[PDB]
């Protein structure tokens, strides 16, 4: 009971953040019908959460040291649960933006502390391997349940979908309080100036990136904000040289195996993000599956991923992360190749969707556990805070960068085959066939990126003694 | 009985040529101890066959159009059979060279005609697909038989190893005489100047490439012969402009999927040749399996390849050559990755050699049939000669080019890990471990080359109607 409550409590914010993220995507069309926030306002509800999630994440890593990791986990999760209630009673556009900003602040504080808790509470060995498998398991369970919950009761209203995080948020706070021990260490002074410039640089960079498409990549407010991001980043690096208790220990990423590992998760997160988005839009637009049936159809992904994670936890103590990452990616590579050739519209479910999803899930499950263990391998307790934050930050940062290239390929080929860059709701059934072949073509580009990820996975070079022993 | 005698007869030269090559490899050390031809002559027995095999191949493609494809097949195989008897009674170094030259001339005349017989004897449809599988099947049966026969009765004498080709050589002539019909077409005049310059250019290019390492890449006989190859090649291209009945129809390779397909088999053949040479030296030097037990240990490869060829022959009428080539290569990719991580000296047979060999065999067998069908797809009868000759030539030309890069990587890492560039018979068991890990490393570079082959295979764009229908 003590072990089971511990792993469930630690992985709670992974369940909440991913489940809330998918519910937001499902409920975004109906927010437009009610609030009438226009097409400009459609992205602010998504970018508001992302803006402060990425802005405050590096602050949230070191915050667990100077206040405590367990208290930081409850405080961060509690703010998220409260923010979801305010989000579900939004009056207008302004209230919904402030509510989404508050959720990201709560999730920015708690997400790094969740992975840092994995590193600290469970001693290296089978306990950390099992905890890592469960931590990555609830990441996938949340997203599917978001589709099912979002797709199930979105008909009655979109407000009820957001209130569903309150029962889950409260039970995780109850489990965390009654199953985690506040290890009383000496509190460490926070880097005031170092954290201010990091938060300023990250928020400004995200603002410029998000606001570019809306207003223009050279208008002046985009590059103007990017100039402030560059200025803060340079001043942050200069100040961190002589900084005590740094927000980012740059000296730490000189091991020649931390850089390789942290470069791998950066692009591996980009491949995973572009894969979920592309498959999500393809299932929604081409197949027309709807959220409820799409969510119920992805249950085999969760069961398949659970098998891959469970197997890999046992295998990580005998095989190095190098082979397991390549072995898992190899399975995913076949699943995406199969889905790149036999994925026309109207194909049945069992032979064409159950198999590649199940095979791909085991590949993702197998490769996630070794990467997570090697990310948090051999750091300490005074430097595990920021290192966990950077692993989350690089995972999320690689999403838009790779996906931007992929979406350009979808758009380029959709015009080449004959198609329109408008909404799917107006298509000629031949422009819609062009879009069908554009998505299937871009899946090869995602496969090309996955090859590069495996290319630098060959430089990881961690033995299983460092990551999953003692 | 007519179909079985036909397919066995047509692919007989592939059995002879491949089997003879492996027997010469196995028997080379014992030829040295008797004839005492020194290290300089060690390669002249191998390069003499290759020098004239590549030199006369392009002339042998057009030779069936002016004399007859059935007559050319019997004459070529008969000269190979007669040359093997002379090769087995060699008195000294000079006569062994002349005997190997005569074998290559017979193989150069028969090999292009053998693949031309596949295209012309069997109508497009299930007959050609089954004949292609058998044609490729007996290439691998021949290689493994060369190990088993070479390694079995090498003990008594190496001369008996070369006489084993006479019972097989005679029966393939008998089958070809009583199972192939001489389709009486009008004989087409031969290109005199074009064939002469093509033979001169190819022989000089091979002579310069072969004699380079022995004498040096800049001595004057290397670039001097290379100068003759370039002068002949340029003159050959000039006279082929106004050539009636050309030896190489350059205009034919402008379809944008003939170039892609023929570039695939060039580098696909280079990948395959480096894979057998690297695995052959690894098994010989590191594992110390000896020829007889190595040959018996590769019997699962023949059975595994037979399953792959048999499955692919039925699947090629429903799936395009694009997906089958990628599907076959994907299986080979996993086998080579598995062998690149869990292949140390001293590992057992069943878990570490039977599985990667069987999986790799099915992968190669699956990919071989679609490539062969698309290579000979949509040509005719008056241009099938040179097209098949070019396909055999590019397959054989890609071997040394890719293998030169792979061997350079093997050597470089052997020194990096701490090793010696001498023979394996003097090793310190720590320099042999460095060589062991060098071969395992170079298997990754072969896997990188296979990926590039897969990328080019996506541009084939043949439907199954063009290659395996009607
Ligand atoms: C230079 C700038 C750095 C590049 C990224 C900028 C922000 C992306 C904005 C796009 C908004 C929506 C998409 C999105 O972003 O999604 C990925 C992820 C969570 O997914 P979402 O919650 O959006 O849900 C998924 C739905 O599917 C969406 O369709 O968001 C992020 O956190 C973005 C990563 C950046 C945060 C961390 C670092 C920021 C600062 C850069 C470091 C150095 C700067 C200093 C100089
Ligand atoms: C991977 C990082 C490793 C380092 C990780 C180390 C760094 C520290 C963090 C550790 C914890 C994170 C791991 C969590 C598990 C991995 C995430 C995941 O897997 O989560 C499920 C996902 C939705 O949840 P998420 O919100 O997490 O999504 C991803 C995030 O957004 C961005 O990472 O859903 C899917 O799997 C999509 C389906 C997969 C398809 C399989 C292939 C079939 C292709 C056929 C084509 C058919 C259609 C045609 C189409 C054209
Ligand atoms: C101490 C350490 C070191 C010190 C420090 C030393 C210095 C650090 C080195 C950094 C990286 C250098 C190169 C990185 C680029 C990637 C390599 C690459 O580009 O080459 C990939 C290679 C060949 O192919 P290419 O054709 O590209 O090469 C030829 C030309 O590029 C084409 O012209 O392929 C492979 O063998 C990879 C095998 C695995 C792939 C199959 C499975 C998928 C992988 C995992 C996915 C995980 C998903 C996770 C989701 C959960
Ligand atoms: C520029 C020159 C072109 C590049 C290749 C040159 C010849 C390789 C000599 C090396 C001798 C031994 C290895 C070898 O070659 O092996 C591959 C194959 C059959 O294998 P082997 O029988 O050797 O047995 C395998 C044992 O394992 C060996 O260890 O040989 C060949 O045919 C070589 C290909 C070239 C022939 C066709 C075209 C030649 C002319 C080039 C075209 C344009 C020129 C005009 C300008
Ligand atoms: C492929 C061309 C397609 C276009 C073809 C179209 C063009 C026209 C011609 C068509 C007919 C040719 C096809 C014949 C079949 C393919 C050849 C083949 O397959 O023949 C068996 C081969 C020996 O016969 P060959 O003499 O023909 O050899 C090749 C030639 O020399 C050059 O092509 O043996 C082997 O398979 C080696 C073992 C394979 C290993 C599998 C992966 C395991 C890796 C684990 C590593 C463990 C050790 C570590 C190591 C470090
Ligand atoms: C029209 C008119 C135009 C003319 C026609 C075009 C011709 C060829 C150009 C492209 C050829 C190379 C393509 C790209 C490449 O080179 O890359 C492969 C690709 C990307 O990955 P990379 O990481 O390399 O890209 C990194 C960056 O290039 C550098 O950073 O991967 C894939 O999708 C391939 C999927 C299949 C591979 C798995 C199965 C094995 C394949 C079959 C082997 C058969 C064995 C032989 C047995 C017979
Ligand atoms: C008609 C069909 C057969 C055409 C498809 C063949 C090519 C047009 C495509 C198929 C896959 C593509 C490759 C897939 C992956 C990549 C990796 C890509 O790099 C990235 O994804 C980098 C992402 C980043 O910027 O962070 C560069 C192009 C490349 C080599 C692509 C080059 C073009 C390729 C070979
Ligand atoms: C010892 C540890 C640190 C592992 C490090 C190995 C990697 C640095 C190797 C393994 C796979 C290699 C790649 C495999 C194949 C290729 C294709 C190669 O070009 C070819 O087409 C090779 C075949 C040829 O034409 O000769 C260019 C380098 C590259 C990307 C290689 C670059 C170096 C890589 C990444
Ligand atoms: O995120 C997952 N899907 C999606 C991601 C998206 C997206 C849509 C989806 C959908 O699925 C979907 C939604 C409504 C109706 C039909 C399908 O539209 C914007 C970009 O992001 C996902 C969750 C769990 C498991 C696998 C996945 Br692919
Ligand atoms: O040609 C095949 N092997 C070889 C190729 C070689 C080579 C050696 C071998 C051997 O095997 C071998 C020979 C003697 C003792 C032990 C092993 O030395 C020079 C370079 O070429 C082969 C044949 C059929 C199936 C698979 C293969 Br890999």
PDB file of C-alpha atoms in Angstrom, chain A residues 137-212:
ATOM      1  CA  UNK A 137       2.390   4.951 -17.570  1.00  0.00           C
ATOM      2  CA  UNK A 138       0.088   7.610 -16.119  1.00  0.00           C
ATOM      3  CA  UNK A 139       1.307  10.072 -18.755  1.00  0.00           C
ATOM      4  CA  UNK A 140      -0.374   7.886 -21.390  1.00  0.00           C
ATOM      5  CA  UNK A 141      -3.393   6.948 -19.250  1.00  0.00           C
ATOM      6  CA  UNK A 142      -4.171  10.627 -18.751  1.00  0.00           C
ATOM      7  CA  UNK A 143      -4.197  11.527 -22.438  1.00  0.00           C
ATOM      8  CA  UNK A 144      -6.533   8.694 -23.441  1.00  0.00           C
ATOM      9  CA  UNK A 145      -8.870   9.351 -20.521  1.00  0.00           C
ATOM     10  CA  UNK A 146      -8.875  12.983 -21.598  1.00  0.00           C
ATOM     11  CA  UNK A 147     -10.248  11.938 -24.983  1.00  0.00           C
ATOM     12  CA  UNK A 148     -12.824   9.633 -23.395  1.00  0.00           C
ATOM     13  CA  UNK A 149     -13.913  12.117 -20.715  1.00  0.00           C
ATOM     14  CA  UNK A 150     -13.746  15.045 -23.116  1.00  0.00           C
ATOM     15  CA  UNK A 151     -15.532  13.165 -25.877  1.00  0.00           C
ATOM     16  CA  UNK A 152     -18.113  11.608 -23.557  1.00  0.00           C
ATOM     17  CA  UNK A 153     -19.651  14.542 -21.651  1.00  0.00           C
ATOM     18  CA  UNK A 154     -18.728  17.399 -23.980  1.00  0.00           C
ATOM     19  CA  UNK A 155     -22.252  17.140 -25.415  1.00  0.00           C
ATOM     20  CA  UNK A 156     -23.918  18.310 -22.197  1.00  0.00           C
ATOM     21  CA  UNK A 157     -21.391  21.148 -21.759  1.00  0.00           C
ATOM     22  CA  UNK A 158     -17.665  21.873 -21.943  1.00  0.00           C
ATOM     23  CA  UNK A 159     -17.634  23.255 -18.390  1.00  0.00           C
ATOM     24  CA  UNK A 160     -18.244  19.828 -16.831  1.00  0.00           C
ATOM     25  CA  UNK A 161     -15.150  18.514 -18.624  1.00  0.00           C
ATOM     26  CA  UNK A 162     -12.874  20.905 -16.738  1.00  0.00           C
ATOM     27  CA  UNK A 163     -14.462  20.162 -13.357  1.00  0.00           C
ATOM     28  CA  UNK A 164     -13.494  16.486 -13.709  1.00  0.00           C
ATOM     29  CA  UNK A 165      -9.914  17.279 -12.639  1.00  0.00           C
ATOM     30  CA  UNK A 166     -11.124  18.204  -9.127  1.00  0.00           C
ATOM     31  CA  UNK A 167     -11.824  14.642  -7.881  1.00  0.00           C
ATOM     32  CA  UNK A 168      -8.523  13.469  -9.374  1.00  0.00           C
ATOM     33  CA  UNK A 169      -6.611  16.488  -8.101  1.00  0.00           C
ATOM     34  CA  UNK A 170      -7.915  16.046  -4.564  1.00  0.00           C
ATOM     35  CA  UNK A 171      -7.198  12.312  -4.339  1.00  0.00           C
ATOM     36  CA  UNK A 172      -3.606  12.815  -5.503  1.00  0.00           C
ATOM     37  CA  UNK A 173      -3.170  15.493  -2.828  1.00  0.00           C
ATOM     38  CA  UNK A 174      -4.587  13.035  -0.298  1.00  0.00           C
ATOM     39  CA  UNK A 175      -2.253  10.258  -1.458  1.00  0.00           C
ATOM     40  CA  UNK A 176       0.734  12.609  -1.601  1.00  0.00           C
ATOM     41  CA  UNK A 177       0.111  13.883   1.932  1.00  0.00           C
ATOM     42  CA  UNK A 178      -0.326  10.397   3.427  1.00  0.00           C
ATOM     43  CA  UNK A 179       2.323   8.506   1.410  1.00  0.00           C
ATOM     44  CA  UNK A 180       5.304  10.883   0.975  1.00  0.00           C
ATOM     45  CA  UNK A 181       7.831  11.787   3.667  1.00  0.00           C
ATOM     46  CA  UNK A 182       9.100  15.356   4.004  1.00  0.00           C
ATOM     47  CA  UNK A 183      12.845  14.730   4.170  1.00  0.00           C
ATOM     48  CA  UNK A 184      14.081  17.541   6.419  1.00  0.00           C
ATOM     49  CA  UNK A 185      17.198  18.865   4.697  1.00  0.00           C
ATOM     50  CA  UNK A 186      18.741  22.298   5.169  1.00  0.00           C
ATOM     51  CA  UNK A 187      16.921  24.787   2.964  1.00  0.00           C
ATOM     52  CA  UNK A 188      19.016  26.238   0.158  1.00  0.00           C
ATOM     53  CA  UNK A 189      18.964  29.927  -0.712  1.00  0.00           C
ATOM     54  CA  UNK A 190      17.231  30.719  -3.997  1.00  0.00           C
ATOM     55  CA  UNK A 191      18.951  32.463  -6.893  1.00  0.00           C
ATOM     56  CA  UNK A 192      16.956  35.692  -7.050  1.00  0.00           C
ATOM     57  CA  UNK A 193      18.493  37.472 -10.043  1.00  0.00           C
ATOM     58  CA  UNK A 194      19.319  34.216 -11.825  1.00  0.00           C
ATOM     59  CA  UNK A 195      15.727  32.998 -11.654  1.00  0.00           C
ATOM     60  CA  UNK A 196      14.271  36.384 -12.648  1.00  0.00           C
ATOM     61  CA  UNK A 197      16.265  36.522 -15.880  1.00  0.00           C
ATOM     62  CA  UNK A 198      15.525  32.879 -16.695  1.00  0.00           C
ATOM     63  CA  UNK A 199      11.781  33.413 -16.238  1.00  0.00           C
ATOM     64  CA  UNK A 200      11.894  36.654 -18.235  1.00  0.00           C
ATOM     65  CA  UNK A 201      13.853  35.052 -21.079  1.00  0.00           C
ATOM     66  CA  UNK A 202      11.639  31.961 -21.318  1.00  0.00           C
ATOM     67  CA  UNK A 203       8.329  33.840 -21.167  1.00  0.00           C
ATOM     68  CA  UNK A 204       9.496  36.464 -23.665  1.00  0.00           C
ATOM     69  CA  UNK A 205      10.786  33.807 -26.069  1.00  0.00           C
ATOM     70  CA  UNK A 206       7.487  31.907 -25.935  1.00  0.00           C
ATOM     71  CA  UNK A 207       5.504  35.124 -26.402  1.00  0.00           C
ATOM     72  CA  UNK A 208       7.488  36.018 -29.522  1.00  0.00           C
ATOM     73  CA  UNK A 209       7.177  32.491 -30.925  1.00  0.00           C
ATOM     74  CA  UNK A 210       3.423  32.285 -30.322  1.00  0.00           C
ATOM     75  CA  UNK A 211       2.676  35.854 -31.435  1.00  0.00           C
ATOM     76  CA  UNK A 212       4.656  35.586 -34.679  1.00  0.00           C
TER      77      UNK A 212
END
